Design a protein around this ligand. Structure first.
Ligand SMILES: OCc1cc(I)c(-n2cccc2)c(I)c1O
Ligand SMILES: [Zn+2]
Length: 197
């Protein structure tokens, strides 16, 4: 009733990577290594790099799913709030209830799990373009952390899993997410709080 969040590189040495976008007031997405936490604006591009030490087999896929970070909320499905699920901002593929979308990939598939009711979005693994050493997926988060009746100020994690063609686990990584109006200021504030402690 709770998906695992244990980091697992697996046989292919799978792990995530993030750009270094800084903390200017205008930044739309920024990652804090000290907090392992991504800060982003609503419905803005979040580039997440995928790194491996060796090439996984054809048919390998990469799935993203959100869970609540606090244990007392972890069994609750993370979903969009009562406002955003009804705002008709569909891209034609993502169900309106799903918090996480993949941008610009027509092969993305959206799952409502028939047993857990949790949402996820999964894409095929594709090799890096010539001249690149990693592959990047562009995610969007479609509600604010503060949305009433949805996340309601509760922190979430995103779990990224590398899976075989049957859905079996090959690798796992994760990061906390805050969706907020000013990611640069919030990253600076939270990193300062961590330092003061
Ligand atoms: O052949 C090299 C290579 C192949 C693949 I397929 C991937 N990959 C794409 C999504 C997940 C892993 C990567 I990163 C890579 O470097
Ligand atoms: Zn919302």
């Amino acid at each position: 009733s709770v998906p695992s969040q244990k980091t697992y590189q697996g046989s292919y040495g799978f792990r995530l990577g993030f750009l270094h976008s800084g903390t200017a007031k205008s930044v739309t997405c920024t990652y804090s290594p000290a907090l392992n936490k991504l800060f982003c604006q609503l419905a803005k591009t979040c580039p997440v790099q995928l790194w491996v030490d060796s090439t996984p087999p054809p048919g390998t896929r990469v799935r993203a799913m959100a869970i609540y970070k606090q244990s007392q909320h972890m069994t609750e499905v993370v979903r969009r709030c009562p406002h955003h699920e009804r705002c008709s901002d569909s891209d034609g593929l993502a169900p309106p209830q799903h918090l996480i979308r993949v941008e610009g990939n027509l092969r993305a598939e959206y799952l409502d799990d028939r047993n857990t009711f949790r949402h996820s979005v999964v894409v095929p693994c594709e090799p890096p373009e010539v001249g690149s050493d990693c592959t990047t997926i562009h995610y969007n988060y479609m509600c604010y952390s503060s949305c009433m009746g949805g996340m309601n100020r509760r922190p979430i994690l995103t779990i990224i899993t590398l899976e075989d063609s049957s859905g079996n686990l090959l690798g796992r990584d994760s990061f906390e997410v805050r969706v907020c109006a000013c990611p640069g200021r919030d990253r600076r504030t939270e990193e300062e709080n961590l330092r003061k402690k």
